[PDB]
Symmetry: D2
Subunit: 317 residues, 4 copies
């Protein structure tokens, strides 16, 4: 029997006999996504080209930014687009701290590559004045996380303590329909995703692992390669078809390139909630403890076996 | 000053003081794409999930199939989805033969990866009865070709003798707006796209080439890796950012995996019209001569220098 | 600062520290409206006309019907489209009884005239088994009522104890935006709306009133005539521009033609909540007490002064 | 077998082995309508209400204005929104003169009443320099005329020498689908449409006619009254259900209130092409000869019998 992101969220909140604050927060994020999805698909692009006569990275941030301040459920907001955390006005304060990537893979949107919105929701901890500090919780403290993928179609994957659920956006009625209830990732996959152009800077562990995929030692079948470049898209494929996604440290930043707060953590959390794993090589991504908000991190995630089979090789070095 | 795919096509046809048959054909293809784009984005998916109470590969084929027969400009139609060429009914016959892939990368649409529609338009040659034979012309005989990419947004790239033009689909008014006039590809790019999982079966030439990209000999900067798996998406990125896309022969079919008639040829033609190259390793893709309609072919295409730099290595072996 | 029907409803519910049952109910009705609005505008009509190869009164009923049973907030449902009240399955029962007109003015939808959805929500009273009886409450017992107008644009007018609010449907992002907060109707208007073809059967009171509008006795300016035929549209214009709408008893049914439960009551309630009036000639519409569910009623509603100025004449006879 | 406004227009043009200038003109008008329809339904209204942070009469005019100049098929353009005719730039000149009402019933768009776009297309006559004079042709000189109705759904009625055809706008794929081929109006209808608030100023003929409808002399059934106020909507209902629409001269302008060039003429032409009639009381609307471009005219149109039955009474006075 049919269900929607809204109906579904207020049923969970109303069942956990909660406040409703998280629900308001999520609903507001949902509206923002729909507005972003509309912009990403080139809503009224004909007008920009003078159909009547006479920056997407920004609009997205504003949508999420504005929609979240407006929910009265947020107090501190961190965004890949803002150098500093944003402190919600006093009258608009809520108990939640949100970290998000308004639009990811944006730079590559000229070639219409799948882009997406990532987000993480923590409950404010210290009773001090809400500040950037409140955002430095480890992914292990997430209350809910997820992302919206603007691909061939627009889907929103939401992971909460109760598991991971996928909602398809029906553009004809502007509603998110639940199409994959309590999702779980394959134990082992047949695909490895990473940028092999930096093959030159791969630390030994990584180079050895990739080698075992192209040329399986047990003379089995090789894995298939796939890398869209837009994380949301890659991680999502990893979640659907199973496999492993990698964006390790190298010659550049030995802490990876991806941002921990609003890129690695939400995805790790989703993965782990779906039965997968997310390690930085040394430790679990959700355990890492934030120092800076734009702090980076190495990430290897996906199907258990694959991530484990990685760590296996990681120790060997 | 604003222009659309329709306004633009009937201005070319009306300027070449032509019949208008090609125009009707293109317009019909345009409608089909809009209908496919709507389906790909999950138009009324809420209804499938019982919002009121109680296969995309197919729908696409039917849209294109029906829309083209209905144009009265086609006589013989070849589609990746039909084992045999389709012979248009006598009353609905036109002078054009069309080859198309209704939906490409379809199998990977579960993970919402960019998919697309590819197409090639030839003028019927022999005055015999229209038959599958009429479809066996070499890509060099194309009258027009192109593809529709259903990615973050829906774009339609159209290449004709007059060059290559890109139109963005404004979903708000269902019109294709011309946003990139007479496109031309970069001489050299900084990205190589291919499935490195079949690294095990790469003939020497390919392995050596990829090696020169990961580890540039002139100790320059390496290329970046990118492979979406969905041709339309990859080829399009190659056209926008420049670079090289490869899907060579191996242990499997030594004639590649891609279909020549409705995948390689249209793309080669677009590439060549934009100033790029499309070789099968031995010869230019547009020169190859069709034997079977579902005949396969190896493809290496993109920026000139890159394709040439490839062939350089190809001869070496 | 921006607000939506959802954000707005769950803020009222969450502020009245309520259950959330009413909220789920309203949200479900909201989804149904968006689905209906999509169908009314001819969503995928191209498919019905064989774009790929090979009743609205009903679809609307099913949407509302299904969406409401699915909310778990309804127990007894009455609809202009169902001869008998519908008793929600035990597992899906809620404390609310809903009366609605899935689509009004439907018969006149061939000429694309504004149509709309009307609805009334009562709280079940007797602790007996939910039955048709539970639906026989007087409009005075309404918990919330309203209607959705599918005109030049789709708007949803919601009236609750806290007043009447209007939400515009942004089709680009499928969200209902609050554009007219706590609405109130003009004291006196300059427009009278009714079907003057039945001038032959007007009881004296009505004929005299209309006369005083066409030929104002105080030799002032006449009122303007307007009658769309589709109630939702007429009543809405009455609410926006002010004035009076009439659909009195005559030679036919001396109880009017409009249905009391799901047409007159919701509108009366909205009117009265916006500062207007709704009388049957003898008494207030919200006071009338239901005998049959499809029971009819005479209605005169709109701006106070105008309705009063009517009753003035009504007594005179 | 499926057909669209575009496919249909370029089949007529291509069949009449014409230039294609009229086709380009119509196509451009079609794009403008789709853009207007999108705006009328409140496309991105959420943005106006600060969803991200921080006049329709005009936008419509600009759309049509710009889209027509851009077609290279117009030379002189008259619009209800421009005090003077507009002379297309030399490089953009075409052989056609167009008269249009970008948006009609606009003032009443606050109550979401059906609005519409009306248009008339004449072929420039004098070989002088294109000037306002070229627009003063009688409706009898029309090459094509029609209107777009933005009601419960968006339809475009197109009347040319070959008859009248109706196209429904499928918003899901932004295409106009032909749903009523070569339309013809009922000989006699059962509905009269006019503003009876001006009952006080009706010349005798009109008052007597209306009387014969409310109280049929042959003691038959009365006609039903209907008046939306927005011409496009009323005239369209008249065309679909049959009947008569009236907007006669009175105490105010004895030449009516409707504009002759871009309101009366297009509708008269459509009516007459559908088998109806359009008189000003004294003569046929299409015969009247323009003096001023914003010149007004009395109009009575619709089913033959009804219009005739009117004129019958008209002579009697
Ligand atoms: O803190 S909540 O927002 N509590 C809550 N949401 C409600 C929605 C309705 Cl309609 C009624 C009552 C609610 O309480 C919440 C939200 C979710 Cl996703 C899951 C658990 C909880 Cl605890
Ligand atoms: O064979 S055509 O279709 N000739 C043609 N198209 C017309 C469109 C109009 Cl509106 C009027 C006259 C036309 O002639 C054609 C179409 C294109 Cl894309 C480019 C060159 C030609 Cl040759
Ligand atoms: O009975 S309710 O549905 N109570 C309620 N709705 C909630 C929504 C959230 Cl997100 C959280 C708590 C809620 O409690 C309700 C709904 C409305 Cl329109 C107005 C007053 C009330 Cl009383
Ligand atoms: O003057 S036209 O525009 N001639 C014309 N239109 C064409 C479209 C195509 Cl695709 C090809 C040739 C054409 O010639 C024209 C347009 C219509 Cl609605 C009806 C008759 C005519 Cl005469
Ligand atoms: Mg990012
Ligand atoms: Mg394919
Ligand atoms: Mg009704
Ligand atoms: Mg007007």
């Amino acid at each position: 029997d049919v269900n929607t992101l809204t109906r579904f969220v207020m049923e969970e909140g109303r069942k956990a006999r909660g406040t409703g604050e998280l629900t308001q927060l999520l609903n507001s994020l949902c509206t923002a996504v729909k507005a972003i999805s509309s912009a990403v698909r080139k809503a009224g692009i004909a007008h920009l080209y003078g159909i009547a006569g006479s920056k997407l990275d920004v609009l997205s941030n504003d949508l999420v930014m504005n929609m979240l301040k407006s929910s009265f459920a947020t107090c501190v907001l961190v965004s890949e687009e803002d150098k500093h955390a944003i402190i919600v006005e006093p009258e608009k304060r809520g108990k939640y701290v949100v970290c998000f990537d308004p639009l990811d893979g944006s730079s590559n949107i000229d070639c219409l590559v799948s882009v997406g919105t990532i987000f993480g929701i923590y409950r404010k901890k210290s009773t001090d004045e809400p500040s950037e500090k409140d955002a430095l919780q480890p992914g292990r403290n997430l209350v809910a996380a997820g992302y919206a993928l603007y691909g061939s179609a627009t889907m929103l994957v939401l992971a909460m303590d109760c598991g991971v659920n996928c909602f398809m956006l029906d553009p004809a009625i502007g509603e998110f329909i639940l199409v994959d209830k309590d999702v779980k990732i394959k134990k082992k996959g047949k695909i490895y995703s990473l940028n092999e152009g930096y093959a030159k800077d791969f630390d030994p562990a990584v180079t050895e692992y990739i080698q075992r995929k192209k040329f399986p030692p047990d003379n089995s079948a090789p894995y298939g390669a796939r890398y869209v470049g837009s994380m949301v898209a890659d991680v999502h494929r990893t979640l659907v078809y199973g496999g492993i996604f990698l964006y390790p440290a190298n010659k550049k930043s030995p802490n990876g390139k991806l941002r921990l707060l609003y890129e690695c953590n939400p995805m790790a959390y989703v993965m782990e909630k779906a039965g997968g794993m997310a390690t930085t090589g040394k430790e679990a991504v959700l355990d890492v403890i934030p120092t800076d908000i734009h702090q980076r991190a190495p990430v290897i995630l996906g199907s258990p076996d694959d991530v484990l089979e990685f760590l296996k090789v990681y120790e060997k070095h």
